[PDB]
Amino acid sequence: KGYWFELPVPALLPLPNGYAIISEFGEHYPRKQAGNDWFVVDPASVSLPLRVRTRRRGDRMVLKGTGGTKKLKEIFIEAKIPRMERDRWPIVEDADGRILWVPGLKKSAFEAQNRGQARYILLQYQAMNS
Ligand SMILES: [Cl-]
Ligand SMILES: [Cl-]
Ligand SMILES: [Cl-]
Ligand SMILES: [Cl-]
């Protein structure tokens, strides 16, 4: 039940788990309240293209601030995610394999800060329900 996508931008990318990832370019840094279902990337500071793929064992990501490095498995357990939905859960990495974001669950230190960059990549994670 595994998958792997190169993530174009702009794009709306339906996923085998019933969710979609939407990408687009934006000039401005987001103002919305912090949440795990959106993400901001600075193209200049991360290796493109982005990919979205399912988990492998050993997968770890570096948390914001002094959070430290955290194994993805631990994140799924703490979130009480059913074993079947984790095997199917999108993981957003850069072209180098750095895990940037686990949509809906956790952000890495690699999320853009508001630093006067000319342009950002904006990501959104949303269900195909209603
Ligand atoms: Cl906004
Ligand atoms: Cl808001
Ligand atoms: Cl958090
Ligand atoms: Cl940044």
DSSP β-bridge partners for residue 107: 101
Looking at all shown ligands, the one closest to residue 64's CA atom is: 3
DSSP β-bridge partners for residue 25: 121
DSSP β-bridge partners for residue 125: 21
Looking at all shown ligands, the one closest to residue 33's CA atom is: 2
Asked whether 124 and 53 are in contact (CB, 8 A), the reply is: no
Asked whether 33 and 39 are in contact (CB, 8 A), the reply is: no
Sketch the domain layout of the chain as residue ranges: 1-130
Find the 75 Cα to ligand 3 centroid distance in Å: 10
Which residues are CB-contacts of 46 (< 8 A; sequence separation ≥ 6)? 94, 98, 100, 110
Q: What burial letters (b/e) apply to 12-26, b meaning 16+ CB within 10 Å? A: ebebebebbbebeee
Pull the structure tokens for residue 4: 């792997």
What technique solved it? X-ray
Find the 1 Cα to ligand 4 centroid distance in Å: 34
Looking at all shown ligands, the one closest to residue 70's CA atom is: 3
Query: Distance between CA 16 and CA 10 in Å, rounded?
Result: 20
Pull the structure tokens for residue 15: 């996923």
Looking at all shown ligands, the one closest to residue 30's CA atom is: 1
Q: Which of 48, 36, 29 is nearest to 122 (CA)?
A: 29
Q: Please tell me the number of Cα atoms within 13 Å of 53 on its side-chain side.
A: 17
- Resolution in units of Å: 2.2
